[PDB]
Design an enzyme around this catalytic site. Structure first.
Site, PDB file in Angstrom:
ATOM      1  N   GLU A   2      70.653  -0.942 167.672  1.00  0.00           N
ATOM      2  CA  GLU A   2      71.980   0.123 169.230  1.00  0.00           C
ATOM      3  C   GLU A   2      70.759   1.022 169.919  1.00  0.00           C
ATOM      4  O   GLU A   2      70.326   1.804 169.151  1.00  0.00           O
ATOM      5  CB  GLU A   2      73.121   1.029 168.246  1.00  0.00           C
ATOM      6  N   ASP A  23      66.856  -1.831 155.741  1.00  0.00           N
ATOM      7  CA  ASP A  23      66.405  -2.207 156.110  1.00  0.00           C
ATOM      8  C   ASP A  23      64.595  -1.847 155.540  1.00  0.00           C
ATOM      9  O   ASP A  23      64.559  -2.275 154.337  1.00  0.00           O
ATOM     10  CB  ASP A  23      66.306  -0.224 156.389  1.00  0.00           C
TER      11      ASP A  23
END
Lengths: 335, 335
Positions: free
Chosen positions: A201, A224
């Site tokens: 994003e 992540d």
């Protein structure tokens, strides 16, 4: 090793998927998950959401599918390409590298500057507007046919084993994608499990992660990478390191429910002798808006794979950390 | 194309041969020349000298066999390697690159620096002592077994076609080596032809090129690369360029006999419609010693292949320039 993830990691990291053009990565994920998911959908932003299980609690695992790269913004009269960065790519990492484009075209990154002082001046304060890509074209017309303006490219670098470490492009975050795929292949979930393979994003745009990608989840766990600060002179106590296990955190000023997820992951790791590291909490400012942002939405935590050389063509992980991460998640999310 | 040199160029450019360790390149040259040379020798400096023909005039063609690279100078307690440059290698070109070592070991180049300002400060004024190589070792002992101090490495980058251009490591000067090999394969010499595949001569050391490598030659022609200044903004009149043909020159203040070689090459190119470019003469100072140095030794000239991105992992040539160079030499040195 006790999983067999090398080929999955090779396939995902080598796939073409700069931000804005991740079709190949989504397709690979779906092929790997055939027979292991009960359904899927792709949202209007390009987030791929899959699910398995029927348990009362709904849990998202979220890894990013896009990689850093370049986008073509100009083609000159001699066929040379001007580029801008996609994601966090330093121009220093691009110097002399080969870039692979969507259609398979290969280009070489050069820098403007003829004299030593020109190049010294340029390279000492490197800007993208001093770079160009040479795709072997001899005119604007030849070049526009191969890589028109708006074309994306990624590193021309793939997967290699480096004495027991794995090195590739796009560990950030194809390694997280591989963890989620492997969990879906192995787990018998006690929850309804959602795997989200998300587009990152851009700051300044509306994303879907805060709303849980339209999934009414009870928990959301980001898978992540985190920088492994265990290289020369970047030697501090409490650093994240390769072979230290998954790095666990929540956001700074997290809610009680988010902190509970972290405590529960820690407990699982302790009970099953899975290595783990406690990462400093995600910085989010110190103001009133930031405080209220953590107390709404879905309780969340982050599990990260330690990675050296993030944003280079040679991101490096320890396969044991990846396996430990899978193991932790299977124990946490299983019966 | 009218020669078939792609595979020869791929083989030579991909071969391991940093300065100090060129065994593989010499071996490849000798294999390619089997049946095309009447003899050879290797001098005490590692220069490989081959010959064919029996004509009265003796002519050397000389290309360098060594490539730029790195040498390991330290191994730390965690297995990371310190390096120094071999040849003209900029530390900027090494950032994030993979290096292949003699024994096949692959390493990743990193830079010291943890904070943005640390890395900015470092990368803006980059020094070799801020780089290191990670070969995946976990201790000094593991690393010393794989890449002990004194180990050489080269770019982990090989040959690729880029829309009709050829790109590889070590065009400087494996392309010159390929030209000489091809001439030896095709020529029926009117001269006694000597092919010298030489080790470069460090400034400050005694080399063998001035003495003609012990060959009592009448002429010596260096087959080198020259920078192709035809990339964005480095746009000047009289620049060397890809597809302009071999670049021809002599040293500044050259002797009458050296200038005659240049005039004779020009004449051959003109008579046979071979493209060529006139390169500025090699700068050698303006003092009395420099003047006398050109008037002794062997009459000499240089023929160079235009090359983009010299000293990068992605040196680029136009195959037509290489073929033109071979053609020029065959016509000059033939009946």
């Amino acid at each position: 090793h006790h999983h067999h993830m090398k080929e999955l990691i090779r396939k995902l990291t080598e796939a073409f998927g700069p931000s804005g053009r991740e079709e190949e990565v989504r397709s690979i994920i779906l092929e790997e998950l055939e027979g292991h998911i009960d359904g899927h959908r792709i949202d209007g932003l390009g987030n791929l959401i899959v699910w398995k299980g029927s348990g009362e609690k709904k849990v998202i695992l979220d890894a990013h599918i896009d990689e850093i790269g370049v986008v073509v913004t100009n083609v000159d009269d001699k066929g040379f390409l001007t580029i801008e960065p996609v994601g966090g790519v330093s121009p220093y990492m691009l110097l002399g590298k080969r870039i692979r484009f969507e259609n398979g075209t290969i280009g070489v990154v050069g820098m403007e500057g003829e004299t030593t002082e020109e190049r010294q001046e340029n390279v000492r304060k490197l800007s993208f507007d001093k770079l160009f890509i040479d795709i072997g074209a001899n005119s604007r017309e030849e070049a526009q046919k191969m890589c028109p303006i708006g074309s994306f490219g990624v590193y021309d670098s793939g997967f290699v084993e480096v004495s027991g470490k794995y090195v590739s492009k796009a560990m950030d975050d194809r390694i997280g994608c591989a963890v989620i795929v492997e969990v879906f292949k192995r787990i018998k979930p006690a929850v309804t499990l959602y795997g989200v393979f998300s587009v990152q994003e851009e700051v300044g745009l509306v994303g879907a992660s805060v709303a849980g990608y339209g999934v009414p989840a009870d928990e959301a766990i980001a898978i992540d990478v985190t920088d492994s600060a265990d290289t020369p002179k970047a030697i501090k106590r409490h650093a994240m390191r390769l072979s230290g296990g998954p790095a666990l955190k929540v956001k700074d000023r997290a809610s009680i429910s988010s902190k509970r997820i972290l405590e529960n992951l820690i407990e699982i790791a302790e009970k099953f002798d899975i290595k783990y590291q406690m990462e400093v909490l995600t910085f989010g400012g110190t103001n009133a808006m930031g405080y209220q942002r953590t107390r709404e939405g879905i309780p969340s935590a982050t599990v990260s794979i330690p990675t050296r050389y993030v944003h280079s063509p040679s991101e490096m992980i320890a396969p044991d950390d990846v396996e430990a991460t899978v193991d932790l998640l299977i124990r946490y999310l299983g019966a």
